[model samples]
Each structure stands twice: as structure tokens, then as C-alpha cells.
Target: MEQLEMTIVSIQTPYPSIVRIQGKINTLQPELWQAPNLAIRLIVSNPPEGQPISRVYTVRSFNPINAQIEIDFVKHEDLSPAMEWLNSAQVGTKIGLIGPRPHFIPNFTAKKHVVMFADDTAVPALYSILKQWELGISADIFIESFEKDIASQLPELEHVKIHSFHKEHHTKGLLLKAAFALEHYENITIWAACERNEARALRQFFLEDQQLNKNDVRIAGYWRDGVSSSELDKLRAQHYQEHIQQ
Candidate 1:
């Protein structure tokens, strides 16, 4: 992993529960900068007894001219390490970061259309992807957010159609329901990221029930409902170790 020290340049609240953080890095790698849906890990805390706690956030935008990167954090009520760091963060606050790691991007050339499902947490990723949208490809996006106007944050693309579902209307699984309700699945690539179980269910529906090719579906679990990110990291590390040992 590449480690860089980032200086917080500015912080703004663009929505009810979203924090837009702009930071300056020492150098910008063009390859990673141009890629859609790249992610970075903020070293939010350094525990006295263990490894540093970090939080993963999507790169909302990258300015190569100034070596600046923007990230939008969807705030939750939980006082996790990231939240604790955010609470004290201000302009000029310096922190350590890992990556510029490339995440998934929809295969526009292989598929005729794209279908995406995202929650508030994945909006930054969605934003990055749509900003680099191909000219002729069209997409149908379903967004589930507490704020109904979350879609406004995305770029206005003539080829894209967005549908927003307010969380107040229902409890959970809004995206899963919306996706399953869709009438057609032909020649369309699927991309989604939200709660862990919800993403898992969506993956099963497309890959197993619908018999879509593995490469056509890109689904990820950004977070879980009742689980802390630190706990999830531990579980992932254990699973990785077991896989490598076998």
C-alpha cells in the first residue's frame, strides 16, 4: 500500500448527513486519478495496543493540477473511529492515507446498458462513475437515501436516468426491492454497493437466480447494519488467512 500524508484543505456539508472533505496530497498518480470508483483509506486512529484503525472512503473527485482529492463521507449516528476523527477535523488538519486503489467500474463496451443500486454511503462512488460515463451508454440508477435530493449531487448526464427512494417511506431493502421489480435484465451490467446483507442478497439474485455471468455483476458490501467497520476488518483478515493457508 502507498502511504501519503494529506493536509485537509477544506470541509463542507453539502447535504444533511454528508461531509465533503477536500485534501491535498504530495503527488498524484494519473493512472489512479482517472479511474472511476477508486477508494482511499483514512488512518483515522492509532490505538496504543493495536494496529491503526482506518476507514475506507471513495474518491469523489481528483484534481491532478493541484494534487487534491475530494471525498464525501456519509455520517451516521454511531461514534466510530472515523466519526471521532471527523469531529475534530478542521482545515489544515494532517492525516495519513493509504491507497488510491482501483475499485469497480461498469463495463460499458460489453453491455448495452447499465443498472446501478446505491445507498447514501455509495453515492460518492456512484458520482465518480457517472462523471466518467461513456458517451452513448445509458444507465438506470436507483438510489436509496435519507435525503430525497441526493441524486442532485450527481452529474447531469443525458444518458442517465436516476430514481430516488427516500428512507422515510420504508425501513430497509429499498434497492433490493427496486432491482428485483425491474422487468428486463438483457444486455445490462449490474453494479451496486450498500449494506452487507442487502448487497449479498442482490448478488445472489443476479448471479444465481437470474443466472447472470459473474463478470457482468459487480456488487459490494460497503458496510453492515449493526456491525462496526473494525469488527468487519477483523473478520475479513481471518477469512483471508484461512484462504491463503488452504
Candidate 2:
């Protein structure tokens, strides 16, 4: 993917401690603007001045009129390097972005129902996906949030049935059990994006517990509890190498 230079134009906090950055990409190609989501690689200061620390983020809903993108920086129990930059960032600050890329779109033609899960961190992507769906599609959304009144933060959609889970609600078990009770079969598809451990648990719940062989799920670990993206990448590479050798 080609990297482009961007300028931070504005910032806002819609939810408590959650920062949303608006960036403008100069000289954008129209073809690239077709995608609803974009990946950004932000470079923060290096303490030792040897290797600069960087983090990737997915920005949703690009503004075609102004060539700007809105990306959210959500806080968890642990503050991340990405949040660190957003906290101190100012307008006109230059940042490097990998530009926009098309996210994986589900096959809505076959599925009668769409079951989805997301934490505050993945809310932007979730919102974008929901906006693109047809009016007739049935959606059940499980949102994990720190805010007490999460319904105020959600978008209005007649087809979507929102279920809010508190930060203390043990999201992994709550979401899994909720899904278990549903009569999901060949007509259902699951989509989830959350912390690493929770995502893995959901994957196992679908594959091992439910034994669904319909290729009907997509799960992504946006971030791990105590691991950085670079570290996770290294670990995944090592695991692949070991599996090959075995």
C-alpha cells in the first residue's frame, strides 16, 4: 500500500476520553477514495532517538467533499502508544498514513441475519459497516462500552437491535451466551472485533462449541491485552515458522 502525508485538521471527543481525529489527505486519487475505511500509521517520538515508535489505526467514513478522514482513538484499561499521540497532537500536525483500503465485506446475499460484536475501539468500523447495509437486513449488535448510556452513542437504525454490555459485564461470556441461545444455523453469520483474548474465545465458541461449518464468521483481534502490534506480528511469524517445521 502507498503511504501518504496527512495533516490533522480537527479533533473531537464524542465519548468520555475517546478522541476522534479529522485528517486531510492532499492529492488523493479518486479510485482510492471508494473504500469506506483507511489504515493510518502514526509515528510518535522515540525516546532514545534510534527507532521511532508507530501504531496503525483504521479510519472510517472518509469525507469526499473535503478529502478528510475521521478516525477514533478509544481508551481501554491500558493506554496505548496510539492514544499517547492523539492526546498531545495538535492541528496542522503531519502524520503518515497507509491510505484507505477496503475492509472485508460480508456476503449479505445468503445470510438472513447478521450478528455482530464490538468494543469502543472498534466502534468506528462497526458504524461504517452498519451504514452500508441494506434496509431489509436484520442485525443484532452487542456493544461493549464504558459509558452507562450507550444507546445515546449508537446510530439510529430500525433494522438493528442494539444490546449494550457494561465494561464490568464480562463481555466474552455475555456475548458468547447471548449468541448461544440464538437459533443460528445456515442462515446466520457472525462478525466480531475486540480485544485479542475475547476474540479468540468467540472464535472457539463458534468453531468448537457450535460446530458451524458454513464459513459464516469473521473475527479480528484489534489489539491484545498487554502486547503491542509489532510484538504480535513477530509472535505470529514465529508461530507460522514453527508450524511449517512441524
Candidate 3:
């Protein structure tokens, strides 16, 4: 649990539904800049009832020299805890965070093709991964976002093909539809993150139904549909306690 405070430096809306936040950290952590798809538990609000409410967000980019970090928040109609904080936050507003948790990087050397599936929530992580992408490695990216410009914001690599799906509503199964339509699955590695149930379905499809090696597919549930982050936190804590007690 690495804890640190970040002071907001700037905020920009690069896309219609994205809020890009830039903040400066007090210390220079080299690991923050090195890892792709690193996540942080941002302390969004402290309630009078219990512990502080935090949300997990991917580090879009980190500059070691300047000690600055960028995180992109996907704007939603509902005012979630993070959104409430964002509404009240301004330049110089400091907030606490708990990570630099490193996530998976595709093994391009071992596989012939890498297939990536991401929703708007995972786009920042995808962007970070692409920033450190290996040259000449073939990849196909499937992105589902309400705003089409979200996928366009990613880096354009010669060996990578990006397919963007625009949906009026941010629903599940869009990536699954694209993935099931794939012609070939051999010699390929999959990396995906999206809604909880949808991610579970993807995991089942690749690892169980398709019988692919577990190591070849990495899927994460970034968020659950209709569930609040605070509620998810409680459920996770309960599950952890039960696991350790057994």
C-alpha cells in the first residue's frame, strides 16, 4: 500500500466523454513511469460513516522528471463518487492515492498475434500498453466506447489494427461479439478488461470453452454494471476475509 498525494496541475477534455487530469506528485518514483497499465486506488471521498471511498484508475502516463501523472476519467451521466470529486476539484487540489500496481504486458516474443479487448474504462490502460509496445509485433485491438474519438486517441502503429465500436449506450457484450467472430485463435494471446460479468464471460469463452492455455489469456473486471465502487469494495473485502479464514 504505497500512499502518496497528488496536486492537480491541469484538467482537459480531450474527447467528448473523457476528462483528462494531470497532477504532480511530491516524489519521483521511477516504477511509475516504467510499468504499462499501472493502476492506482485514488481516494475520492471520505465519508462520516466509514472508511474513505476510493476508485481504481489506470495511469495514462507518468513523467519521472516532472513527477507528473495523467489519468483519464470516462464521464458518465450518473455522478459517481469520483465524478463528484472531479466536479469540486480544481488546480492545486491535492488528493491521496495508494498504488503503482503493475499489470500484465503481452508477451509479444512468445506469440505470433496479440488480441486486445477494451471498453472505455480500459482505454487508458490500453493507451499505456501501446505506448510501450514492441516494434513489429502484430496486434488487433477491439475497443467499445460511446465516443468514437476514444479509440482514435490511441497511438497508430504499423503492425497494429484497431477496430472501434460506437454504441449509443455503454452496454456489455460488445467486445465479446467481436471476439467470437474471429477467424483464428491459434498462436494468439488475449488481454481484456471491461464490465465484470462481461469479463467473466470472456474468461469462460477463451479459457474454458475454447480450451486455450490460462497463461495466454488475461482478463480483468474493471467494474460491474449497476454496482457502485464502494459496494464493490465491501464485497471484495468480505471475499478476502472469507478466503483467508478457510
Candidate 4:
């Protein structure tokens, strides 16, 4: 992970209080700037004791001419060093960037259509992936967000069908809807990112009950309730080891 210094070039409130952070990276590959799965690790200046507070965000979009990168975030009830820094970030504020590494890449080259399930927090990556899809490729998208206005920010595409879900409704029903909608397709690719419990439940539904091949699905939790990414990293390592050993 290389430490590249980045400066905040521009910031926008795309929807309500949600912040869209655009940065001018000192050093980044133009071709890989907005490439699928590329993510950045923001080094936390101040963090609570015993908590490793470095946070990662997916690079929303990039501009090669200006060496620019885009990331979106919003304020929450929870106390977070990352959120604090983002909320008060200045125009020329310098921050340490740890990487432009592969993080989440949805397989869009499936034999049939693509299906994506995401929440507001995970929408940036989903949007990035959708933009990269080839022309005429159809998609079924289910997005969950507490605010209806925020969910409405997603643009309508000719070949893409969107299903928006409110937080009050059970997520299982949403997953079931997507599953049944795409059941007729012989070859499918499923990509999902959301809360931990919902992610786990969807994994079981797709891999176990639905009998989908392991290679045909990707599911990840962007954040877990009462848990931090540091702990999730450890779990990820353990799961990787188990899968490789199997």
C-alpha cells in the first residue's frame, strides 16, 4: 500500500447531506483510476484507544486529465473519526491515501443478465460497476435506503430496472423478489453489499437454497452492526484461509 498525498479539490452535496468528495491524487494510474474494485484507505489522524480506525472507500469515479478521484459519504448517528474528518474536510486539506487496490468487482460478463443488491452506503460501488457494463446488457437492481429521496438519486438506464426498498421492510422479501425475477435466466451473476446479517442471509439463499455456483455470486457486508472493519478484516482473512484450504 503506497502512501500518496491527496488534496480535496471539490466537494458537493449530491443528495441532502451526503458528501461527494473529489480529490486530485498526486500519483495514480490514469487507466486504473476508476477501474472496478479499486478502493482507497484513508489514514485516521486521531482514533480512540485500542481501535484501529483507518477507513476505506471505493473510488466513485475518476478524471484522468486532472488526476481526480471521487468518493461519497454521509453523516450518521455513530461517532466515527472518518466521518468527523470528512464532515470538516477543507478545500486544501491533505490526507494520506494508502491504496488504489482491488476491493469489489462485480462480474458483468455473465451469460445472462446481471443482478445487484445494495444499500445507500454501498451504492457508489454499484453505480461504478453499472457504468462499466457494455451497451445493451440488461440488469436488475434492488436498492435499500431509509430515505426515499436519496434512493431516487440513482439514474434510470434504458436496460436497467431498479427496485427500491425502504429500511422498514424485511430485506429477505427484496432478495426473494430479485431471485424470482431472474430465475428464468440460465446463467446469472449476483452481486450484493449491505449489512452483515442481510448479507449472510442472502449468501445462504443464493448459494445453498438456490443452488447457484460459488463462482457466480459475490456478497459482502460494507459494515456490520456493533462491529468495525478491523474485526471484519480478521474474519475475512480466516474465511480466505478456509476457502483456500478447502
Candidate 5:
């Protein structure tokens, strides 16, 4: 529950920004935390008119005890103010933060085996998942990026087997086909975040056709066709709560 309100102390050049924050850093006793992930709610002004923005991102990184924290920004969709701001921000920019909200603490030791997959949008979550594997639990990660040489994105992760699948293929089948090639392990969990329609269809295949245990799989779309995160949140909620007698 640790939180901070901060300002942009400086730009780390075309990559990430260094933020200096001051507030009651509400955090769990480090001993009680199993998830190595941490998040900062760098709240920002709403999307500009015709700008198609939502809440500021929750910058998730390794929490350090210091006056400042660093956040890396990737080029998301075009025409995004956040992307624009990252390019134009300066040393004195003021901002707000609401959390170091921990997320996706998948325990491979609990399941005993886990398989993680993602596209560019899920890279942050993959980083968090890979961090957890450092505790000696065996896990694997398959990530699809815009280029064939994206393994360089994460140099700090070791132990977890990482598969770089950046080759081009038919739109919806590339990732799924790659995943199917891996031998499915028992007592395993399959976690994925990808494009909305593809994720929706993939989830349907698992839950409907493949009949995967409903409780064990977590598939989500970080973004959809021409939809905002705020709106997608509502849509996902409704989808999550629907009832159909089988």
C-alpha cells in the first residue's frame, strides 16, 4: 500500500524519465511481500480533446528506497500525449503518484509449472513475472515484439527460460501456434495478454473448445481495436461476469 506523489526530476533521454517523489511511502513490510513487482500511480491530466487518452500509467518497477524513482516509456499507439510528453518533457515537470500497487504475483512453486506469453503491450507484466522466478521457481516466457532482436529488452532476467518469437506470420496464428508447440505441463498456468480480438478469440478457444479449467487461465487484452482502456475495463468486467449455463 505504499504510495508517492512526485514530479519529473529529469529526462533520461529518449528512453525513460526519472521522477522525484515525496509522500508517505505506504509499503508492505518487505518480508510479507511475495510479488517482487511495484507500481507508481503517476496520475496525470486527462486526455486532451481529441487526444484519446485515459488515466496516467501505473509505472511498475523495482521499488528502491530513495528520493526518486525511474520509469521507462515505450512508444504505444500513435497520437498519444503521453508518448509526446515523454519526448518533450523537461527537468521541472510536476506530476502525481498514487501507488506502488503490486500485480500478477504468479507463484510457479504453487502451480509447480507456469508458461507466460505476451506481445509488446504485456512487456511490463512479463518483467514483473520474470522477477518472481528469480526466487528459484521454474518458469518460461515467450514474448513477441516488433523486431526479431528484442531479447535485449530485458538483460536483468535470468533463470526463467525466455523464448523470443518475433517473426512475422499470419496475424492471429503466429503467437498461438508458437504456444501450441510447447508441451503443455500438468498443474500448469497459462498467462497471456495480447491484442483484444486475438486475445478474445484465444480465450474462447481455451475456455470453449479446449475446455481449459476456467479458474486456471488468465487471458486479457491490454488494448482493443479503437477502444480506450477505461472503456475496455468496463467491457472486460461485463465479459468476466456473464452467465451461461453449460
Candidate 6:
């Protein structure tokens, strides 16, 4: 793994101190990826005497040769301690980064097609995947939007079909509906990143009850309505039962 040295250049959204690496800009795509383009750790500095020193963020993008990289504050608007540091970072604020850990993990190959259902929390991942599909990988995406007007995010792709979900009171409901609609028992690889028990139940139905190969499907709970991240992860982990006990 190649590690790069980066400094804070600026912030974005007045939320996460969006640090832009000074001169990092190079096109590594359309070629074999030598490193995970989105993997990097942010080591914050000069924290309050006894506080934690740093936080790790998915390296949103980087250029090793030019020594440039970008990372974001995972938690922003809450005035949380992390947000405090991010909001205070200034240009030339030194930081450390470690990684090239696998980014761009393509969901293996599928002859049938790729179908994805994601809510806003998974937008970063979805955007990354879509951009990587410049090679014409066939995919169908259904995303539940934060606002009704999501047509702007519907990127045009030669081999990609996108459906920005219909209106629904519950985000999870829209996700499950889209998931079921896209699940054709063909060789299709279903990748769902949503948030709720409905999804947990649906994946279980296909995997346990229907006897589908675990490797053939991928699902995740990006968030849960009114639940903490830990609880959200637990419900999603019910997949173990779906695979065995169920």
C-alpha cells in the first residue's frame, strides 16, 4: 500500500473540513488500479491535551504522484468534537494519511446484470461505482432520494439503467419495493444498500428460504429509521441467521 502525505487545503459545505491535497490530480482509471482510489486515513493533530488524536475517513480521492488527497468529516452538523476539529482545520494544517487499502471492490462478474438499491447514505459509494463503470459495465440503479427532485443525479451511462424511486412516506419502503422489483431470478447480482428490517427480511427470504448462494447477493443497512448505527449493524447482521438458522 502506498501512503501519501497531504495537507488541508480547504473545506466544503461549511460542514466537513473538505481538505484538498495541494496538487493531486491524475487520471489512473481506464487502466489497472494500482491502489484503492478511495482509501485513506486522516490523522488529526493538535487536539485538546487529552482527547483522541485522529479519525479515519474513506479517502474520497487522491493522486499519489502529485501528493494530493481529500477526506471528509463523517459527522458534521452536530457540533460534535470531530466536527469541531474539522471546522477548525485551516490551509497548511498538517495531517497524516495511511492506505491504499482496496477501494473499488467490483461486485465480481455477472453475466445477467447488476442491480443496486441505495438510499442517500450510500450515495458516495454509488457515485464511486458509477464513475468506475466507464468501461460499460451493465447496471440498473434505484436510489431513494432525500428530495423529490433526484433527476439531476441520474447519470447517463451506455450500460447503466437508473430509476430514481417513486414517492414513499418511508425511505425503507421505497428501498424494499425497488429491491423486489429488480430481483429477477436470473444470473443477476443484486446489491442492496438500504436501511431497515424490511430489507433484512427480504434478503433472508431470498437467501434462506429460496436457497440462493450467499455469494450471489450483497446487501447492507446504510442506516435505520430512529436506530443508532450499532443497532442498525446488528439487524443487518441477521444475515447470519438467514444463512444458517433461518
Best by lDDT: 1
- Tens digits of per-residue lDDT for model 2 on 1-246? 556777999988777757778888874484676464445666654566577676767766677788887777776554666767676789998877664556555447764688888877677777777666677788888877776665565578887888878776333456666666665555777888888888888889878877755456777787887798879878989999999998
What value does the lDDT take at residue 213 in candidate 6? 74
Q: Per-residue CA lDDT of candidate 4, range 175-215, in tens?
A: 54566566464677778888787788888888887788876
Best by TM-score: 1
- Comparison by lDDT, 3 against 4, better one: 3
Per-prediction TM-score to the true structure, in the order listed: 0.94, 0.86, 0.93, 0.85, 0.71, 0.63
- RMSD (CA, Å), each prediction: 1.8, 2.8, 1.8, 3.1, 5.2, 6.2
List candidate 4 stretches off by more than 4 Å: 46-52, 168-186, 238-246
lDDT of 1 by residue, 1-246 (tens): 478888999999999788999999875455567688989889999878987889999989988888899999888877889999998999999999998888888878664688999998899999999888888888899998988699988888897899999887334678999888886888788999998999999999999898888988999999998888889999999999999999
Residue-level error in angstroms, candidate 3, position 81: 0.8
**Per-residue lDDT over 1-246 for candidate 3, one digit per residue giving the tens place of the 0 to 100 score:** 368899999999898888999998775456655689899989999778987888999999998878899999988888799989988889999999888898877767664698999998999999999998989889999998989767778899997999998889633478999889986988888899988998898999999888878878888889997999878888999999999999
Estimate the TM-score for candidate 6.
0.63
What are the clashing pairs of model 5?
1-26, 2-26, 2-27, 3-26, 39-100
Give the poorly placed runs of model 3, Cα more than 4 Å off: 47-50, 170-172, 244-246
Question: At residue 46, what lDDT does model 6 achieve?
Answer: 43
Clashing pairs in 2: none
lDDT of each: 0.88, 0.72, 0.87, 0.74, 0.57, 0.55
User: Which candidate order results from sorting by TM-score in descending order?
Assistant: 1, 3, 2, 4, 5, 6
Steric overlap count per candidate: 0, 0, 0, 0, 5, 1
Q: Considering summed lDDT, which 10 consecutive residues are worst modelled in model 5?
A: 14-23
Look at candidate 6 and tell me the lDDT of residue 25.
25
Residues 74-163, model 5: lDDT tens digits: 555456545565556666666555655655455454545667667766666676555445465566777877656555556454456778
Pairs of colliding residues, candidate 4: none
